[PDB]
Subunit: 223 residues, 3 copies
């Protein structure tokens, strides 16, 4: 009886703490900057246009088209690198092309069967599949949905789902919102599971390089 | 030679610390309360009786029967909610019906293929399959076992295994023992992997509501 | 505008911390002790010779041959135990036969489909398959390779990959280098995911027993 009351009080404390955390995340999402360089429809159309070719040729053509359409906002060939991404129980790899305080663009995918938590979104993400399959299991439902090359899954602000990718699944991902808040999730398993400090090095390095490119382009466009 | 001695001393320290942790868990489990509302055979039979229907109809009928035989011990329809559960490398979802200091009842399952650590049990758990398959790989053996709808897997007090569930696997779970000790494992991956603070919110909220229902029924009785 | 600079500075802090960690791991791995009892080719051939039999008979014969060719360096039958191993998102089981400050030998495998991060290697590992399949996805590439019984996968000093094992995959693993540096990765999921303190107990116990056996053999060979 007394232990039950103590447990209920502790659970209520954890409840209000977690609620405060979620509210602070929502506040940082709301009060974030809304200066956007790209649009989700643009990236979706550009990725869907090349979804029928081989995924490597699609990567190359999409990178060339992005550098053509937005000069100074895409990393150079010397800065492109495949970096592992372990998060929410799943493992894939990314190649970052653009990343700012409010937007990011990358090529994400896995060559093996994987799956796990989508990650509690607090920014808007869009994934247009180039190859493979994407099984999404939304919250509150007991059934999943499959998406194929050409489809574009939009992960909204409040959504959390179960993601699963078959072997050889590759897609182009564009994220809009409070981008730094995603880093934590993208590195969670890197910190407490894989102990891969060199992957963390590569991730923070490519993010810092993208931020430096954005600042340099800003200065060159106001200079 | 010296680094070997330092490593051995560190290993012995970790050994005694882990042993003390296990001893504290065992002591809190044994000297825990044993006031039981349900029995594992009751829940097992109730789930096996409706395992042949569709799993949603089975959920509905099992909830109705539980409210009929135990009215003040099952959450209301307004309090039922599917909450994600990330633990031991696997991901599923639960709907809690009953939960006290010594017992809990829920509907657990996944719509995708998943698997991982069963979690070092320090309470007794029972899962009666309604749909899908349950692959259990016990500790110390090199072979696994498959379980189908109608079967009931009993996770004993000391057992730790490797669990795996195929897509669309749904079952009814009843646990008796030191329930708070399970929260740690049930929230480990929620804390250090998914960063899903809202799922933690939902979990602690439904547990607090179940405890409140139990306390209200106790006070009214 | 200012937040971009602040975020870049924070990323530089994380960058230099991770770089120091990687450099310290490389330096502590280098200039390390070089007292080696086994060689990867010996273990590879011993396992490949018995890869055609049942994996349990193969385990037994390999243990007998290891005790025959290297007496006093393999644990006794009373000290052999199957211990779960949760790491990098995957889960298997091990039976440790030899383990020192510079080398370790064990029988590793899983009875279920599993996979995840290989673990950022800072020691040289070799896995010779007795049964099942081993899918390895090296870093920087978008395609994986499958290995079958008889094959030997060599995880080099700097490599990090994605490992995947099908149900019933069993192999003999020999690791050479700075063995303690692997311990962290071997226990990460045990600490922050499974909460399995008894598996941690078993792991540290068998490692201490292997170290004690090695020290006893050293003393008996100089005594």
């Amino acid at each position: 009886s007394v232990d039950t009351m103590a447990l209920w009080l502790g659970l209520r404390a954890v409840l209000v703490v977690a609620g405060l955390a979620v509210l602070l995340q929502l506040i940082r999402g709301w009060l974030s900057s809304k200066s956007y360089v790209f649009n989700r429809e643009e990236i979706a159309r550009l990725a869907k246009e090349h979804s029928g070719l081989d995924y490597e040729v699609a990567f190359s053509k999409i990178i060339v088209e992005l550098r053509k359409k937005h000069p100074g906002h895409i990393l150079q060939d010397e800065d492109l690198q495949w970096v592992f991404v372990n998060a929410g129980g799943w493992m894939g790899s990314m190649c970052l092309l653009h990343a700012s305080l409010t937007e990011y663009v990358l090529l994400f995918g896995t060559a093996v069967d994987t799956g796990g938590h989508s990650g509690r979104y607090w920014a808007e993400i869009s994934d247009t599949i180039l190859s493979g399959t994407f099984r999404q299991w939304k919250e509150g439902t007991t059934k999943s949905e499959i998406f194929y090359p050409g489809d574009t899954i939009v992960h909204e602000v409040g959504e959390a789902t179960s993601v699963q990718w078959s072997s050889g699944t590759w897609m182009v991902e564009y994220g809009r919102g409070f981008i730094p808040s995603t880093l934590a999730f993208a590195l969670a398993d890197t910190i407490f599971s894989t102990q891969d400090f060199l992957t963390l090095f590569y991730t923070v390095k490519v993010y810092s390089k993208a931020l430096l490119l954005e600042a340099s382009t800003h200065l060159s466009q106001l200079g």
